[PDB]
Design an enzyme around this catalytic site. Structure first.
Site, PDB file in Angstrom:
ATOM      1  N   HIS A  82      10.870   4.686  -2.626  1.00 20.06           N
ATOM      2  CA  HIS A  82       9.914   3.876  -3.422  1.00 20.06           C
ATOM      3  C   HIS A  82       8.501   4.125  -3.964  1.00 20.06           C
ATOM      4  O   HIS A  82       8.286   3.808  -4.966  1.00 20.06           O
ATOM      5  CB  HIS A  82       9.904   2.471  -2.488  1.00 20.06           C
ATOM      6  CG  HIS A  82      11.177   1.978  -1.987  1.00 20.06           C
ATOM      7  ND1 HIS A  82      12.104   1.240  -2.846  1.00 20.06           N
ATOM      8  CD2 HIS A  82      11.695   1.845  -0.713  1.00 20.06           C
ATOM      9  CE1 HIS A  82      13.212   1.045  -2.047  1.00 20.06           C
ATOM     10  NE2 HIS A  82      12.792   1.203  -0.702  1.00 20.06           N
TER      11      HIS A  82
ATOM     12  N   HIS B  46      -0.190   5.646   0.350  1.00 23.04           N
ATOM     13  CA  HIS B  46       0.734   5.794  -0.831  1.00 23.04           C
ATOM     14  C   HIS B  46       0.146   5.166  -2.199  1.00 23.04           C
ATOM     15  O   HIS B  46      -0.836   4.559  -2.025  1.00 23.04           O
ATOM     16  CB  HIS B  46       2.098   4.849  -0.643  1.00 23.04           C
ATOM     17  CG  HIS B  46       2.081   3.535  -0.479  1.00 23.04           C
ATOM     18  ND1 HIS B  46       1.738   2.928   0.764  1.00 23.04           N
ATOM     19  CD2 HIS B  46       2.091   2.754  -1.374  1.00 23.04           C
ATOM     20  CE1 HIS B  46       1.518   1.810   0.645  1.00 23.04           C
ATOM     21  NE2 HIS B  46       1.665   1.316  -0.800  1.00 23.04           N
TER      22      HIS B  46
ATOM     23  N   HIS C 269       1.292   3.154  -6.033  1.00 29.49           N
ATOM     24  CA  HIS C 269       2.068   2.632  -7.118  1.00 29.49           C
ATOM     25  C   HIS C 269       1.796   3.067  -8.360  1.00 29.49           C
ATOM     26  O   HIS C 269       0.180   3.326  -8.761  1.00 29.49           O
ATOM     27  CB  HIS C 269       1.831   1.203  -7.013  1.00 29.49           C
ATOM     28  CG  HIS C 269       1.956   0.454  -5.730  1.00 29.49           C
ATOM     29  ND1 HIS C 269       3.564   0.073  -5.248  1.00 29.49           N
ATOM     30  CD2 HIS C 269       1.348   0.890  -4.692  1.00 29.49           C
ATOM     31  CE1 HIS C 269       3.399  -0.170  -4.116  1.00 29.49           C
ATOM     32  NE2 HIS C 269       2.176   0.058  -3.628  1.00 29.49           N
TER      33      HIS C 269
ATOM     34  N   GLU D  37      -1.031  -2.516  -9.083  1.00 30.55           N
ATOM     35  CA  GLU D  37      -0.401  -3.945  -8.597  1.00 30.55           C
ATOM     36  C   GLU D  37      -1.385  -4.781  -8.805  1.00 30.55           C
ATOM     37  O   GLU D  37      -1.327  -5.838  -9.600  1.00 30.55           O
ATOM     38  CB  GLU D  37      -0.089  -3.671  -7.187  1.00 30.55           C
ATOM     39  CG  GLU D  37       1.068  -2.723  -7.171  1.00 30.55           C
ATOM     40  CD  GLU D  37       1.867  -2.962  -6.062  1.00 30.55           C
ATOM     41  OE1 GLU D  37       1.406  -3.055  -4.826  1.00 30.55           O
ATOM     42  OE2 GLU D  37       3.027  -3.041  -6.148  1.00 30.55           O
TER      43      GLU D  37
ATOM     44  N   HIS E 164      -3.138   2.830  -1.858  1.00 28.95           N
ATOM     45  CA  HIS E 164      -2.885   1.763  -0.922  1.00 28.95           C
ATOM     46  C   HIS E 164      -3.434   2.627   0.515  1.00 28.95           C
ATOM     47  O   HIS E 164      -2.352   3.418   1.083  1.00 28.95           O
ATOM     48  CB  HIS E 164      -1.989   0.966  -0.893  1.00 28.95           C
ATOM     49  CG  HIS E 164      -1.866  -0.036  -1.857  1.00 28.95           C
ATOM     50  ND1 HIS E 164      -0.522  -0.681  -2.227  1.00 28.95           N
ATOM     51  CD2 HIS E 164      -2.766  -0.497  -2.641  1.00 28.95           C
ATOM     52  CE1 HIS E 164      -0.758  -1.480  -3.203  1.00 28.95           C
ATOM     53  NE2 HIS E 164      -2.268  -1.530  -3.531  1.00 28.95           N
TER      54      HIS E 164
ATOM     55  N   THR F 240       3.082  -5.821  -0.380  1.00 31.92           N
ATOM     56  CA  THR F 240       3.642  -5.969  -1.824  1.00 31.92           C
ATOM     57  C   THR F 240       5.071  -5.267  -1.996  1.00 31.92           C
ATOM     58  O   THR F 240       5.617  -5.255  -3.234  1.00 31.92           O
ATOM     59  CB  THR F 240       2.567  -5.177  -2.814  1.00 31.92           C
ATOM     60  OG1 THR F 240       2.705  -3.766  -2.792  1.00 31.92           O
ATOM     61  CG2 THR F 240       1.292  -5.437  -2.705  1.00 31.92           C
TER      62      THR F 240
HETATM   63  C1  LIG Z   1       6.677  -4.707   7.393  1.00 28.27           C
HETATM   64  C2  LIG Z   1       7.489  -3.526   7.884  1.00 28.27           C
HETATM   65  C3  LIG Z   1       7.772  -3.160   8.952  1.00 28.27           C
HETATM   66  C4  LIG Z   1       8.339  -1.960   9.212  1.00 28.27           C
HETATM   67  O1  LIG Z   1       8.677  -1.686  10.399  1.00 28.27           O
HETATM   68  N1  LIG Z   1       8.345  -0.979   8.153  1.00 28.27           N
HETATM   69  C5  LIG Z   1       8.064  -1.299   7.008  1.00 28.27           C
HETATM   70  S1  LIG Z   1       8.044  -0.156   5.763  1.00 28.27           S
HETATM   71  C6  LIG Z   1       6.925  -0.722   4.473  1.00 28.27           C
HETATM   72  C7  LIG Z   1       5.480  -0.540   4.802  1.00 28.27           C
HETATM   73  O2  LIG Z   1       5.222  -0.265   5.837  1.00 28.27           O
HETATM   74  C8  LIG Z   1       4.599  -0.967   3.632  1.00 28.27           C
HETATM   75  C9  LIG Z   1       4.942  -0.712   2.528  1.00 28.27           C
HETATM   76  C10 LIG Z   1       3.974  -1.338   1.331  1.00 28.27           C
HETATM   77  C11 LIG Z   1       2.712  -1.688   1.934  1.00 28.27           C
HETATM   78  S2  LIG Z   1       1.393  -2.210   0.576  1.00 28.27           S
HETATM   79  N2  LIG Z   1       2.137  -1.797  -0.773  1.00 28.27           N
HETATM   80  O3  LIG Z   1       0.516  -1.445   0.836  1.00 28.27           O
HETATM   81  O4  LIG Z   1       1.389  -3.719   0.710  1.00 28.27           O
HETATM   82  C12 LIG Z   1       2.427  -1.916   3.044  1.00 28.27           C
HETATM   83 CL1  LIG Z   1       0.981  -2.878   3.488  1.00 28.27          CL
HETATM   84  C13 LIG Z   1       3.096  -1.563   4.020  1.00 28.27           C
HETATM   85  N3  LIG Z   1       7.373  -2.392   6.744  1.00 28.27           N
HETATM   86 ZN   LIG Z   2       1.293  -0.389  -1.646  1.00 32.40          ZN
END
Ligand SMILES: Cc1cc(=O)[nH]c(SCC(=O)c2ccc(S(N)(=O)=O)c(Cl)c2)n1
Ligand SMILES: [Zn+2]
Length: 258
Positions: free
Chosen positions: A62, A92, A94, A104, A117, A196
Site C-alpha cells: 500500500h 510513510h 501517500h 490525504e 505521516h 486513513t
Molecule cells: C490498526 C493496526 C493494527 C495493526 O496491528 N497493524 C496495522 S498496519 C496499518 C498501520 O499501522 C497504519 C497505516 C496507516 C496509518 S495513517 N495513514 O498514518 O493514518 C497509520 Cl496511523 C497506521 N494497523
Molecule cells: Zn498515512
C-alpha cells in the site's frame, strides 16, 4: 479481494469490510483554514528525534514504511495538543499519479503532491497494537510535500526504493535521520481522527504542519516507480494511494497559530 486503491477495492469500498469507514471521526479531512479555531493554550510541538533508530524499510503493498526501534523512548513526540509521550514507530507517505494530487488532508481544498505521516503511539498503552484500540492511542504528524527544490534529507529514502519495488520486499535501513524531513516551522492544525487505511480505527490525534516541505520532481517520480503488486505479478504502479477527505461531522480543527 482485499482492500487497496483501485476501482474495485479503493476507498469507496472499504466500508463493506470496515464499517467504521462511515464513522464519526474519520480521516483525512479538508482543513478549512478560515474556520480552524486558534487555540492560544495549545503548546509548541516537541519533536525529539536526536536518538532515533531506524531499522528497516518495507513495501507493504500500500505504501513503504520506514520502521524504527520503538522499544525505548528514543524518538518521541510530546507537547502540542498531547498530554502524553508518543513514540515513533514508522513513517510513510501517500502520493499521486500527477503532482496535482496525492495528499490525504487538503487545505482549503488544495491537494499537495504527497503527504508524510510520522506515526507515534502513546506510551501509556505499552505498544502499538494496544494503543490503536484506544481513543488517544496514536499521534500522527502529517507534513505536506510540494514539488520544487529537492529535499536532501529525503534522498537516502528515494535511493533505496529500487530494492523494495514490489509488495513484501524489505531492506535494512539504519541511521536514517527523520529530522531531515521536517520543515522550518512546527506551526500545526490538530483534530481527532482515524487511521486513513483499514482498519480505519478511530485512535489518532492528528497534528498537520502548516508548512509543506519541497521535494523535487525526480524524488517524487521515484516514489511512482514502486509497485503495489508482488514480484512475478503484473505491474501495477504504486500511485494514488491516498484516501480522499471525509466528512468533518461533529469536529473542530484547532490551530496553533495566527
Ligand atoms: C490498526 C493496526 C493494527 C495493526 O496491528 N497493524 C496495522 S498496519 C496499518 C498501520 O499501522 C497504519 C497505516 C496507516 C496509518 S495513517 N495513514 O498514518 O493514518 C497509520 Cl496511523 C497506521 N494497523
Ligand atoms: Zn498515512
Amino acid at each position: 479481494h482485499h482492500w487497496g486503491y483501485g476501482k474495485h477495492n479503493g476507498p469507496e469500498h472499504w466500508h463493506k469490510d470496515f464499517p467504521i469507514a462511515k464513522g464519526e471521526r474519520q480521516s483525512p479531512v479538508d482543513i478549512d483554514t478560515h474556520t480552524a479555531k486558534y487555540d492560544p493554550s495549545l503548546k509548541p510541538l516537541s519533536v525529539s528525534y536526536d536518538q532515533a533508530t531506524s531499522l528497516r524499510i518495507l513495501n507493504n503493498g500500500h505504501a513503504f514504511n520506514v520502521e524504527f526501534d520503538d522499544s525505548q523512548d528514543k524518538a518521541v513526540l510530546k507537547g502540542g495538543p498531547l498530554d502524553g509521550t508518543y513514540r515513533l514507530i514508522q513513517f510513510h507517505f501517500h502520493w499521486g499519479s500527477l503532482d496535482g494530487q496525492g495528499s490525504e488532508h487538503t487545505v482549503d481544498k488544495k491537494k499537495y503532491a504527497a503527504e508524510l505521516h510520522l506515526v507515534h503511539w502513546n506510551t501509556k498503552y505499552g505498544d502499538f497494537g494496544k494503543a490503536v484500540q484506544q481513543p488517544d492511542g496514536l499521534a500522527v504528524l502529517g507534513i505536506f510535500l510540494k514539488v520544487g527544490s529537492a529535499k536532501p534529507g529525503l534522498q537516502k529514502v528515494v535511493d533505496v526504493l529500487d530494492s523494495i519495488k514490489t509488495k513484501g520486499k524489505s531492506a535494512d535501513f539504519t541511521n536514517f535521520d527523520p529530522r531531515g524531513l521536517l520543515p522550518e516551522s512546527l506551526d500545526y492544525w490538530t483534530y481527532p481522527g482515524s487511521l486513513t487505511t483499514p482498519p480505519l480505527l478511530e485512535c489518532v490525534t492528528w497534528i498537520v504542519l502548516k508548512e509543506p516541505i519541497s521535494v523535487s520532481s525526480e524524488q517524487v517520480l521515484k516514489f511512482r516507480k514502486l509497485n503495489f503488486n508482488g514480484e512475478g505479478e503484473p505491474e501495477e504502479l504504486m500511485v494514488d494511494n491516498w484516501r480522499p477527505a471525509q466528512p468533518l461531522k461533529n469536529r473542530q480543527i484547532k490551530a496553533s497559530f495566527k
